[PDB]
């Protein structure tokens, strides 16, 4: 339960409704319950983890996200997995990343 | 010159990581393009995937590879990259 | 022949003047006094530079034409990690039955 | 070099009455979606995109 | 009989009195309000999509007009298309009157479609 | 008595030839673009270059009309896409244009108007 | 209301302009006029906003986003910004 | 030098004064000295250094937790925070 109402705006989006919905309420629930933008994106990437957790082996992706006011990424993802929204001032940005540990000219 | 907070990485590639950084900074005035540079930079030399946080305030918690991760300060820019793709 | 209501009283001079309008293709909505902080010389500075065409909608979208060098680029990558996967799966099974 | 037009009028010439027509809406171009156009491209991976 | 008006001889919509002057941040409001009114939770339409594209610029177009510029030229356009994965980019620049002249424009989202409008007002002199 | 009411003071070749306007449209297209495939960094270029690739030989031409250049720049993946428009105007003086161009993988939609000063 | 040079929306024109002046009947004391107004203006769009009120000063003010206001009335001189 | 309230290192309002003090007697119109100090001051301390000087003032602002100055000097007092 959220303990005041918070404001959400999307800035920008590729994941499906009922992941990003789940990610917004994680961002509501993380904006209520802590203050530190560090622990709000620690809180953030567990949250999603929890839900939608990968198989642990390199060939499926871990999450990453970082909570911020003046930031910028330059950040890469597998298809359709960015979640960029503000929540009332604070910018949220959430992504899973893929590890290829089988890349040519890696040896 | 680089103030370093928090690293995984060996100082070659450290100092390659603050003068590629402070090249972007010296070709963009932009927050947008400098993130990117030194993205393409470290995909093209260190192999992908590489990612990149540049501001003054965000806070963060990702997961990365070790040996592949760094967090340095430029002056009033805090920079953080690790390579996780 | 019917006079507005709203018409100015001008004299004949003064409707005889030549006023010359002006057409320029910068958007209003722009702000002019841009200041972005220069890194380089640490200090706050003007952008007098600003992009006038208008910005509606874009998107990056996650596709790529099959006939493109980068779709080209990415099916190979993909396919030589899966024969990769495939050859280290077929080595712990060899050192298996070994 | 900015796009520019520059034009010259007499000062009695303003205020011309607003002769203004209500058309209706056109159809510009109607592109309805093509199945086979869309079986020519694949997901990108990874996506590149750079945010403020 | 073909009834003539002389010209006013003012030059700026300023001297008709106040809010004939194109105001952006009212048409915008007016746009986002026809979008949360017709477009939230629609699906995209390929047999329909024609027909919401012009009753939405038809619709925009006399409820901009009930602002009061009269002696603004408007402009309404609408676009709609459908959420596939595909790469866009709607830009737009003209030509025209700076102190006399504005826009405004929007967009709304969703998985099945894109809807864009747009609308510029400019003042005849 | 010189007839201007017929054009509200605008003499006939201050009127646009729409085959010209299209024209001019179309070589802005080709060379903004030309023959290269979609390109997701080239896309925002090639849409700013198409339009002042437009508006340059829109002002060029000189006559006293008000231009709006819209530029719509599609990825062919097979995506619906339905475009209308409806404007308040006068006219005897404006009128509009819109071009419609795609090769294997590029769709681009140029909508011009023009308004009498 | 005199204003010499911003850039703003309207809509906080008209809020800034009638709040201030609204506050100036009510209030007998300096410093009130400034808090008031800008504890108003918070909790209405954003949060960060800084106000400055009286006669016979002067100040460079480092740039805005949108959001800079400079009133002039009443031999009263109004400063808001974000 | 007459300060009476702030907060900042013992190091720094020095740095605030030999900054402004001789800048305040350089100039002679108040209104490019803020635009003065705030460009170096700026490239000397950190970014956000919103300055107010004159005289008769009444101000409400947003100051961080170790960023605010209040000079009182020749009858004109300054103060400056981030």
């Given at each position: 339960q959220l303990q005041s109402q918070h404001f959400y705006k999307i800035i920008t989006s590729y994941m499906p409704e009922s992941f990003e919905q789940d990610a917004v309420q994680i961002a509501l629930i993380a904006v209520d319950k802590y203050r530190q933008l560090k622990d709000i994106a620690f809180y953030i990437k567990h949250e999603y983890d929890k839900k939608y957790p990968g198989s642990?082996?390199?060939?499926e992706g871990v999450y990453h996200c970082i909570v911020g006011k003046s930031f910028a990424s330059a950040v890469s993802h597998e298809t359709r997995q960015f979640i960029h929204m503000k929540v009332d001032t604070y910018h949220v940005i959430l992504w899973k990343s893929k590890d290829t540990p089988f890349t040519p000219g890696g040896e | 010159k680089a103030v370093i907070k928090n690293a995984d990485m060996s100082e070659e590639m450290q100092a390659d990581a603050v003068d590629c950084a402070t090249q972007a900074l010296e070709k963009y005035n932009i927050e947008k393009d400098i993130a990117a540079y030194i993205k393409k930079e470290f995909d093209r030399k260190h192999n992908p995937t590489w990612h990149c946080i540049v501001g003054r305030n965000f806070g963060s918690y990702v997961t990365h590879e070790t040996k592949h991760f760094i967090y340095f300060y430029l002056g009033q820019v805090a920079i953080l990259l690790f390579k996780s793709g | 022949i019917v006079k507005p209501d709203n018409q100015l009283w001008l004299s004949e001079a003064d409707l005889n003047e030549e006023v010359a309008k002006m057409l320029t293709a910068?958007?209003?909505?722009?702000?002019?006094?841009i200041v972005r902080f220069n890194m380089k010389d640490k200090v706050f500075k003007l952008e007098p530079m600003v992009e006038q065409t208008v910005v509606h909608y874009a998107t990056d979208g996650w596709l790529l034409h099959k006939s493109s060098d980068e779709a080209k680029r990415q099916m190979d990558m993909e396919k030589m990690e899966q024969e990769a996967s495939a050859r280290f799966q077929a080595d712990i099974d060899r050192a298996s039955h070994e | 070099m900015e796009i520019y037009h520059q034009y010259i009028k007499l000062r009695?010439?303003?205020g011309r009455f607003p002769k203004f027509g209500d058309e209706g809406s056109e159809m510009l171009a109607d592109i309805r979606p093509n199945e086979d156009h869309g079986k020519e491209y694949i997901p990108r991976n990874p996506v590149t995109t750079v945010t403020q | 009989k073909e009834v003539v008006y002389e010209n006013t001889?003012?030059?700026?919509?300023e001297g008709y009195g106040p809010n004939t002057k194109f105001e952006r941040h009212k048409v915008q409001a007016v746009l986002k309000q026809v979008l949360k009114e017709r477009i939230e939770k629609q699906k995209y339409d390929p047999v329909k999509g024609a027909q919401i594209s012009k009753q939405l610029a038809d619709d925009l177009r006399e409820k901009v007009k009930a602002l009061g510029y009269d002696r603004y030229k408007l402009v309404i356009q609408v676009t709609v298309g459908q959420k596939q994965g595909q790469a866009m980019r709607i830009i737009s620049r003209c030509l025209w009157d700076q102190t006399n002249d504005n826009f405004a424009s929007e967009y709304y989202e969703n998985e099945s479609m894109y809807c864009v409008c747009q609308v510029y007002g400019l003042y005849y002199e | 008595m010189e007839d201007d009411t017929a054009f509200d003071g605008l003499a006939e070749d201050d009127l646009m030839d729409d085959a010209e306007v299209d024209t001019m449209v179309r070589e802005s297209i080709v060379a903004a673009i030309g023959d290269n495939q979609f390109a997701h960094n080239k896309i925002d270029s090639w849409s700013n270059n198409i339009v002042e690739g437009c508006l340059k030989r829109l002002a060029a031409m000189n006559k006293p009309f008000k231009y709006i250049v819209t530029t719509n720049l599609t990825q062919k993946a097979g995506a619906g896409l339905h475009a209308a428009s409806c404007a308040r105007w006068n006219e005897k003086t404006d009128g509009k244009l819109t071009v419609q161009w795609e090769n294997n993988t590029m769709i681009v939609l140029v909508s011009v108007y023009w308004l009498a000063v």
């Amino acid at each position: 339960q959220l303990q005041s109402q918070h404001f959400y705006k999307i800035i920008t989006s590729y994941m499906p409704e009922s992941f990003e919905q789940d990610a917004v309420q994680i961002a509501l629930i993380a904006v209520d319950k802590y203050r530190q933008l560090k622990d709000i994106a620690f809180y953030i990437k567990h949250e999603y983890d929890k839900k939608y957790p990968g198989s642990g082996k390199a060939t499926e992706g871990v999450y990453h996200c970082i909570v911020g006011k003046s930031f910028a990424s330059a950040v890469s993802h597998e298809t359709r997995q960015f979640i960029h929204m503000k929540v009332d001032t604070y910018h949220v940005i959430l992504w899973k990343s893929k590890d290829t540990p089988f890349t040519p000219g890696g040896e | 010159k680089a103030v370093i907070k928090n690293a995984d990485m060996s100082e070659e590639m450290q100092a390659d990581a603050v003068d590629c950084a402070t090249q972007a900074l010296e070709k963009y005035n932009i927050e947008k393009d400098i993130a990117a540079y030194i993205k393409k930079e470290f995909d093209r030399k260190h192999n992908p995937t590489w990612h990149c946080i540049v501001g003054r305030n965000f806070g963060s918690y990702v997961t990365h590879e070790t040996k592949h991760f760094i967090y340095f300060y430029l002056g009033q820019v805090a920079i953080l990259l690790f390579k996780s793709g | 022949i019917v006079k507005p209501d709203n018409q100015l009283w001008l004299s004949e001079a003064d409707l005889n003047e030549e006023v010359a309008k002006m057409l320029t293709a910068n958007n209003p909505a722009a702000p002019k006094n841009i200041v972005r902080f220069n890194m380089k010389d640490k200090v706050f500075k003007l952008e007098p530079m600003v992009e006038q065409t208008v910005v509606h909608y874009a998107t990056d979208g996650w596709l790529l034409h099959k006939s493109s060098d980068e779709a080209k680029r990415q099916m190979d990558m993909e396919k030589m990690e899966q024969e990769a996967s495939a050859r280290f799966q077929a080595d712990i099974d060899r050192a298996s039955h070994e | 070099m900015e796009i520019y037009h520059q034009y010259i009028k007499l000062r009695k010439q303003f205020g011309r009455f607003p002769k203004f027509g209500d058309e209706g809406s056109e159809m510009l171009a109607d592109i309805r979606p093509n199945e086979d156009h869309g079986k020519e491209y694949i997901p990108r991976n990874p996506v590149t995109t750079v945010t403020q | 009989k073909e009834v003539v008006y002389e010209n006013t001889f003012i030059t700026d919509p300023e001297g008709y009195g106040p809010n004939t002057k194109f105001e952006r941040h009212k048409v915008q409001a007016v746009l986002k309000q026809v979008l949360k009114e017709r477009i939230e939770k629609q699906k995209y339409d390929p047999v329909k999509g024609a027909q919401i594209s012009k009753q939405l610029a038809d619709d925009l177009r006399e409820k901009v007009k009930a602002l009061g510029y009269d002696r603004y030229k408007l402009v309404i356009q609408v676009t709609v298309g459908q959420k596939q994965g595909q790469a866009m980019r709607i830009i737009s620049r003209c030509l025209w009157d700076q102190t006399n002249d504005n826009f405004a424009s929007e967009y709304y989202e969703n998985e099945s479609m894109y809807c864009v409008c747009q609308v510029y007002g400019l003042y005849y002199e | 008595m010189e007839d201007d009411t017929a054009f509200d003071g605008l003499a006939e070749d201050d009127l646009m030839d729409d085959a010209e306007v299209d024209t001019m449209v179309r070589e802005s297209i080709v060379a903004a673009i030309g023959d290269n495939q979609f390109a997701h960094n080239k896309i925002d270029s090639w849409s700013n270059n198409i339009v002042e690739g437009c508006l340059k030989r829109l002002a060029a031409m000189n006559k006293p009309f008000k231009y709006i250049v819209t530029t719509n720049l599609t990825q062919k993946a097979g995506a619906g896409l339905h475009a209308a428009s409806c404007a308040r105007w006068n006219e005897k003086t404006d009128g509009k244009l819109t071009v419609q161009w795609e090769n294997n993988t590029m769709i681009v939609l140029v909508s011009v108007y023009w308004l009498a000063v």
